[PDB]
Short mmCIF file of all heavy atoms in Angstrom, two decimals:
data_model
loop_
_atom_site.label_atom_id
_atom_site.label_comp_id
_atom_site.label_asym_id
_atom_site.label_seq_id
_atom_site.Cartn_x
_atom_site.Cartn_y
_atom_site.Cartn_z
N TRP A 39 -1.89 12.11 -5.13
CA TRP A 39 -1.39 13.26 -4.32
C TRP A 39 -1.41 13.07 -2.80
O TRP A 39 -0.47 13.52 -2.17
CB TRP A 39 -2.07 14.55 -4.72
CG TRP A 39 -3.59 14.55 -4.53
CD1 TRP A 39 -4.48 14.25 -5.44
CD2 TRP A 39 -4.33 14.92 -3.37
NE1 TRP A 39 -5.77 14.37 -4.92
CE2 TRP A 39 -5.67 14.71 -3.60
CE3 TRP A 39 -3.89 15.24 -2.00
CZ2 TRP A 39 -6.68 14.95 -2.65
CZ3 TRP A 39 -4.83 15.48 -1.08
CH2 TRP A 39 -6.18 15.37 -1.42
N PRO A 40 -2.36 12.40 -2.18
CA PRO A 40 -2.30 12.09 -0.79
C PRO A 40 -1.08 11.25 -0.35
O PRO A 40 -0.74 11.36 0.83
CB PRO A 40 -3.54 11.39 -0.39
CG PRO A 40 -4.50 11.79 -1.52
CD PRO A 40 -3.57 11.65 -2.71
N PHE A 41 -0.54 10.59 -1.25
CA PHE A 41 0.54 9.58 -1.00
C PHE A 41 1.91 9.92 -1.35
O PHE A 41 2.80 9.10 -1.26
CB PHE A 41 0.06 8.25 -1.59
CG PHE A 41 -1.35 7.84 -1.23
CD1 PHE A 41 -2.44 8.09 -2.09
CD2 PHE A 41 -1.59 7.19 -0.02
CE1 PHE A 41 -3.73 7.66 -1.75
CE2 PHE A 41 -2.87 6.86 0.35
CZ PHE A 41 -3.92 7.05 -0.51
N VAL A 45 2.61 11.46 5.88
CA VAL A 45 1.47 12.19 6.54
C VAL A 45 1.95 13.16 7.42
O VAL A 45 2.67 12.93 8.34
CB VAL A 45 0.61 11.12 7.06
CG1 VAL A 45 -0.54 11.84 7.96
CG2 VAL A 45 -0.08 10.18 6.10
N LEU A 50 -2.62 18.26 8.50
CA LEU A 50 -3.88 17.52 8.09
C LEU A 50 -4.85 17.41 9.32
O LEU A 50 -5.87 16.88 9.11
CB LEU A 50 -3.57 16.13 7.56
CG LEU A 50 -2.90 16.09 6.13
CD1 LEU A 50 -2.63 14.72 5.79
CD2 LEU A 50 -3.83 16.80 5.14
N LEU A 52 -4.75 15.40 11.95
CA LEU A 52 -4.94 13.99 12.35
C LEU A 52 -4.06 13.71 13.49
O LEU A 52 -2.97 13.05 13.39
CB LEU A 52 -4.59 13.17 11.09
CG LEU A 52 -5.23 13.50 9.75
CD1 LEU A 52 -4.71 12.66 8.66
CD2 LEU A 52 -6.71 13.33 9.88
N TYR A 55 -3.08 10.04 14.00
CA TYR A 55 -2.69 9.29 12.97
C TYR A 55 -1.49 8.34 13.44
O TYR A 55 -1.57 7.24 13.27
CB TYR A 55 -2.14 10.07 11.85
CG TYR A 55 -1.68 9.28 10.66
CD1 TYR A 55 -2.63 8.57 9.90
CD2 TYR A 55 -0.36 8.98 10.39
CE1 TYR A 55 -2.25 7.77 8.87
CE2 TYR A 55 0.09 8.20 9.31
CZ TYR A 55 -1.01 7.52 8.58
OH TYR A 55 -0.64 6.70 7.51
N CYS A 94 -3.45 3.20 5.04
CA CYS A 94 -4.64 3.89 4.80
C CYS A 94 -6.01 3.26 5.11
O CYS A 94 -6.87 3.82 5.72
CB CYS A 94 -4.66 4.32 3.30
SG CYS A 94 -5.91 5.40 2.71
N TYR A 97 -6.21 3.27 9.10
CA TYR A 97 -6.47 4.52 9.81
C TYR A 97 -7.97 4.92 9.47
O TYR A 97 -8.49 5.69 10.36
CB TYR A 97 -5.57 5.55 9.35
CG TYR A 97 -5.86 6.96 9.93
CD1 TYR A 97 -5.69 7.18 11.34
CD2 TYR A 97 -6.54 7.95 9.32
CE1 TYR A 97 -5.95 8.37 11.90
CE2 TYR A 97 -6.94 9.12 9.88
CZ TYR A 97 -6.61 9.30 11.17
OH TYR A 97 -7.00 10.52 11.77
N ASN A 98 -8.54 4.61 8.40
CA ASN A 98 -9.83 5.10 7.89
C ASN A 98 -10.81 3.89 8.04
O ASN A 98 -10.75 3.13 8.99
CB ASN A 98 -9.64 5.61 6.49
CG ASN A 98 -8.80 6.87 6.37
OD1 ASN A 98 -9.18 7.85 6.99
ND2 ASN A 98 -7.63 6.66 5.90
N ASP A 103 -13.51 8.62 1.00
CA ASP A 103 -12.96 9.06 -0.17
C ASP A 103 -11.45 8.68 -0.32
O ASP A 103 -11.01 8.26 -1.30
CB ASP A 103 -12.98 10.63 -0.26
CG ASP A 103 -14.31 11.04 -1.03
OD1 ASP A 103 -15.22 10.13 -1.36
OD2 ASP A 103 -14.50 12.27 -1.17
N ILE A 104 -10.62 8.88 0.79
CA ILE A 104 -9.21 8.56 0.71
C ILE A 104 -9.14 6.99 0.49
O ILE A 104 -8.05 6.60 -0.20
CB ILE A 104 -8.57 9.06 2.02
CG1 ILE A 104 -7.03 8.87 1.93
CG2 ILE A 104 -8.96 8.27 3.27
CD1 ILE A 104 -6.44 9.82 0.85
N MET A 107 -9.49 6.20 -3.02
CA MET A 107 -8.19 6.57 -3.74
C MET A 107 -7.15 5.47 -3.63
O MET A 107 -6.56 5.11 -4.60
CB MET A 107 -7.75 7.92 -3.28
CG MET A 107 -8.64 9.00 -3.50
SD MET A 107 -8.17 10.49 -2.82
CE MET A 107 -6.96 11.15 -4.04
C1 LIG B 1 -2.13 9.35 2.99
O1 LIG B 1 -3.18 8.99 3.86
C2 LIG B 1 -4.20 9.92 4.14
C3 LIG B 1 -4.16 11.04 3.54
C4 LIG B 1 -5.10 11.99 3.94
C5 LIG B 1 -5.27 13.38 3.30
O2 LIG B 1 -4.37 13.76 2.55
N1 LIG B 1 -6.36 14.23 3.63
C6 LIG B 1 -6.51 15.49 3.14
C7 LIG B 1 -8.00 15.71 2.79
C8 LIG B 1 -8.62 14.32 2.24
C9 LIG B 1 -9.69 13.74 2.93
C10 LIG B 1 -10.22 12.64 1.89
C11 LIG B 1 -9.43 12.56 0.64
S1 LIG B 1 -7.95 13.47 0.75
C12 LIG B 1 -6.08 11.74 4.77
C13 LIG B 1 -6.21 10.39 5.29
O3 LIG B 1 -7.26 10.09 6.25
C14 LIG B 1 -8.26 11.02 6.51
C15 LIG B 1 -5.12 9.54 4.97
O4 LIG B 1 -5.11 8.30 5.51
C16 LIG B 1 -4.52 8.19 6.79
#
Side-chain angles (χ1 to χ4, degrees):
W39 60 266
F41 304 98
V45 171
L50 290 178
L52 309 174
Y55 183 73
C94 186
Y97 178 76
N98 295 292
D103 272 2
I104 189 67
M107 294 172 86

